[PDB]
């Protein structure tokens, strides 16, 4: 069946109009899609907010507005506010069947963007004797809530044994994240070089050790 | 008010059976028409069945035709869904929601499903030191790798809980069917390593406690 898509992520500033789209791969979506969206917020709060194309629920604010536009669905917030940063999901019915989108998050600038702070940690003696080695990145305080992490071992970019949390919500209201390296004893030992990379906003903070 | 509650989930191992229920209140649960939906550990939203005001047409997608069933009790303003021959891909948050005129207004608070072999683990418990003398300033960070361990949650506490400004608790990764995860706390230079820091990690599920010194 249908691949729903919608952007991955979007920042806006509070105050101003945003739109976010919704896809389908089967060509054009029309008015017997019947095109919701749902709102999550943190603590999987599920919220829906328009359905049928463009008919709003009762209690959601007027800034919200949906629309088909050029053959996709979409959504409208009009003097987005800080209370807005939520993932926005979509849903397209397909004669009995709903199909959903991946999500887009939505952040609302509600203070001002913080680079990560990176800390790269060497396994420790006790893992080595199991035979393995965990190396960990921690990025914590940054905002915007997405980062890109790209891991080298002696220069040469990393494809295989990585896994990176996605990102969490902090009590300051910032994001943290942590990403793995999983080698074998052997493998650390037979390397000398190694980085954690983390992309944010455009700049790329390195943390590395031999 | 609107209220949906769903329950019955838990631990189940692939293969198994298990019933959801979603209980509602504050509105005629009778007229409307309703649906699960479920949200994947990555965090994908995946609809699973639909019934209609009166239960006569039911629909599923193709990957749950013929294990879940939906059915409804409109005597009890209770939504249930029979789940058979589970599958580790069935792990999930379960919600119910209502067809409100054709928005998916009102959402419960959805109940935890994991299906999986693994069995009760312990979580090994190593230190996170800087190592490399060559720190960056006034302030270290050290931290704690819980790997290994099955089923969720488990808590960190530092120092007992005397530590608490400037902890970070990561999420969990699924590594091999166990999760592991990572905690850190940055503490002023003066501090460590003249007095002592110590992870406290417990894991409820096997009833473990381990207490893991930073030493550097």
């Known amino acids: 069946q249908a691949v729903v898509t919608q952007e991955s992520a979007l920042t806006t500033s509070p105050g101003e109009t945003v739109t976010l789209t919704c896809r389908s791969s089967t060509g054009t979506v029309t008015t017997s899609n019947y095109a919701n969206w749902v709102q999550e917020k943190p603590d999987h709060l599920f919220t829906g907010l328009i359905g049928?194309?463009?008919n709003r629920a009762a209690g959601v604010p007027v800034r919200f507005s949906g629309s088909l536009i050029g053959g996709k669905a979409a959504l409208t917030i009009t003097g987005a506010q800080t209370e807005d940063e939520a993932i926005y999901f979509c849903?397209?019915?397909?004669?009995?069947?709903?199909?959903f989108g991946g999500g887009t998050k939505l952040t609302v600038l509600g203070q001002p963007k913080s680079s990560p702070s990176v800390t790269l940690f060497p396994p420790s003696s006790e893992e080595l004797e199991t035979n393995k080695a965990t190396l960990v990145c921690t990025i914590t305080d940054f905002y915007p809530g997405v980062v890109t992490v790209d891991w080298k071992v002696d220069g040469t970019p990393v494809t295989q044994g990585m896994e990176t949390t996605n990102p969490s919500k902090q009590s300051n209201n910032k994001y943290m994240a942590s990403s793995y390296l999983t080698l074998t004893a052997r493998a650390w030992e037979r390397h000398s070089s190694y980085s954690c990379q983390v992309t944010h906003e455009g700049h790329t903070v390195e943390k590395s050790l031999s | 008010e609107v209220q949906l509650e769903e329950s019955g989930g838990g631990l189940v191992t692939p293969g198994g059976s298990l019933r959801l229920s979603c209980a509602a209140s504050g509105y005629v649960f009778s007229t409307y028409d309703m649906s699960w939906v479920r949200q994947t550990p990555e965090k994908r939203l995946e609809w699973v069945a639909f019934?209609?005001?009166?239960?006569?047409?039911?629909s599923y997608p193709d990957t749950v035709k013929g294990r879940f069933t939906i059915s409804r009790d409109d005597a009890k303003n209770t939504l249930y869904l029979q789940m058979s021959s589970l599958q580790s891909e069935d792990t999930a948050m379960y919600y119910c929601?209502?067809?409100?005129?054709?928005?998916?207004?009102?959402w419960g608070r959805g109940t935890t499903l994991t299906v999986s072999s693994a069995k009760t683990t312990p979580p090994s418990v190593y230190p996170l030191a800087p190592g490399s003398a060559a720190q960056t300033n006034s302030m270290v960070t050290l931290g704690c790798l819980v790997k290994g361990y099955f089923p969720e949650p488990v808590t960190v506490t530092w120092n007992s809980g005397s530590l608490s400004s400037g902890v970070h608790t990561f999420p969990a990764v699924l590594q091999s069917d166990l999760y592991t995860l990572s905690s850190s706390v940055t503490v002023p230079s003066s501090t460590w390593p003249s007095e002592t820091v110590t992870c406290n990690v417990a894991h409820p599920a096997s009833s473990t406690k381990v207490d893991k010194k930073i030493v550097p």
């Open positions: 019934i209609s005001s009166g239960g006569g047409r039911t």
């Open positions: 849903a397209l019915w397909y004669s009995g069947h709903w199909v």
């Open positions: 929601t209502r067809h409100f005129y054709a928005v998916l207004d009102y």
């Open positions: 049928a194309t463009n």
